[PDB]
């Protein structure tokens, strides 16, 4: 005879992301090869890691200018892919389409200041701990911090560690959960010599072990 089958209830519908293929309608088509085409990228995070992009400081500029006032705090900016300073970044552009992330984030400092001006600076990262960031340039030494002087190089790279409770952290910082979300970076000027309009440009790229997890389509369409 013939095989008996049972038509299950609930299966068979169309789902936007089902893994089954369709039935061809026009066979025997051979397309010219696209071999040895320069500039082929297969992973978005590879492109994000390879090429850093600038940060957007206040007033809409990608450098921080030396300040001639008692506040040794050059500036602070939130470390979050949804922050105001990371708004014009490729990493944030990728991250807006995913729900969770985990890994390291790198920071690049480059001195476009004049050669005849020498100075000393430090950078300090503060995880979501104490209620107030250490605005004091000395209080931030107790954090995980680094020191660099523009006398051996004009480039200095600082890695931002991943510190949180769970394994994966949100990328889409919630309306609730006020107070410093997770992390801030503030940069101090230990000393400066004839640096009144000397510049300092900061750029951010993905770390070696960065990772994004859950693809969503969040925008308003």
């Amino acid at each position, epitope marked *: 005879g013939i095989v008996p089958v049972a038509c299950s209830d609930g299966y068979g519908g169309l789902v936007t992301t089902d893994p089954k293929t369709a039935d061809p309608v026009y066979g025997k088509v051979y397309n010219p090869p696209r071999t040895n085409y320069p500039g082929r990228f297969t992973n978005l995070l590879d492109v994000a890691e390879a090429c850093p992009t600038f940060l957007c400081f206040d007033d809409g500029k990608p450098y921080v200018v030396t300040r001639e006032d008692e506040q040794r705090l050059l500036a602070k900016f939130d470390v979050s892919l949804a922050a105001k300073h990371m708004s014009n970044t490729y990493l944030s552009g990728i991250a807006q389409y995913y729900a969770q992330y985990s890994g390291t984030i*790198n920071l690049h400092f480059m001195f476009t200041g004049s050669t005849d001006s020498k100075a000393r600076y430090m950078v300090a990262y503060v995880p979501p701990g104490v209620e107030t960031p250490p605005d004091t340039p000395e209080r931030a030494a107790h954090c995980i*911090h*680094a*020191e*660099w002087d523009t*006398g*051996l190089n004009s*480039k*200095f*790279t600082f890695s931002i560690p991943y510190v949180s409770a769970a394994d994966y952290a949100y990328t889409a910082s919630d309306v609730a959960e006020t107070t410093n979300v997770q992390g801030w970076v503030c940069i101090y000027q230990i000393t400066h010599g004839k640096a009144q309009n000397d510049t300092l440009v900061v750029s951010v790229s993905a770390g070696k072990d960065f990772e994004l997890r859950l693809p969503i389509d969040p925008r308003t369409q």
Partner: nanobody, 122 residues
């Protein structure tokens, strides 16, 4: 615990070459700037070299510029100081150190090695 182990020191003639090795153990080898410091007898520790951890870079002191070579191996967690064109002023103990900081000061580097003795014979 970030631990640094130095090796490769010894006695060597002036004008020769010697290579020092810094074996490092820990989860933070890939985020730390690593450089070398030399402590002459009766003198304080002084920066002699440093290598970055992202692009690779290089930076040598003026007294050793054009004569030294510092290299890192991330896969083996080893940092080496390739030394050439020896002079008698280089007789000192060489200390491997690292931190997120890149400076010429020595007090700013949290982690230090036990040091190795390098003697230059004229």
């Amino acid at each position: 615990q970030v631990q640094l182990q130095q090796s490769g020191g010894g006695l060597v003639q002036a004008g020769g070459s010697l290579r020092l090795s810094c074996a490092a153990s820990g989860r933070a080898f890939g985020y730390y700037y690593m450089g070398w410091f030399r402590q002459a007898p009766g003198k304080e520790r002084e920066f002699v070299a440093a290598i970055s951890w992202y692009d690779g870079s290089t930076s040598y002191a003026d007294s050793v510029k054009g004569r030294f070579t510092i290299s890192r191996d991330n896969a083996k967690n080893t940092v080496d100081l390739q030394m050439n064109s020896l002079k008698s002023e280089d007789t000192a103990v060489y200390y491997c150190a690292g931190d997120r900081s890149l400076t010429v000061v020595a007090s700013s580097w949290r982690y230090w090695g036990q040091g190795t003795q390098v003697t230059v014979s004229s």
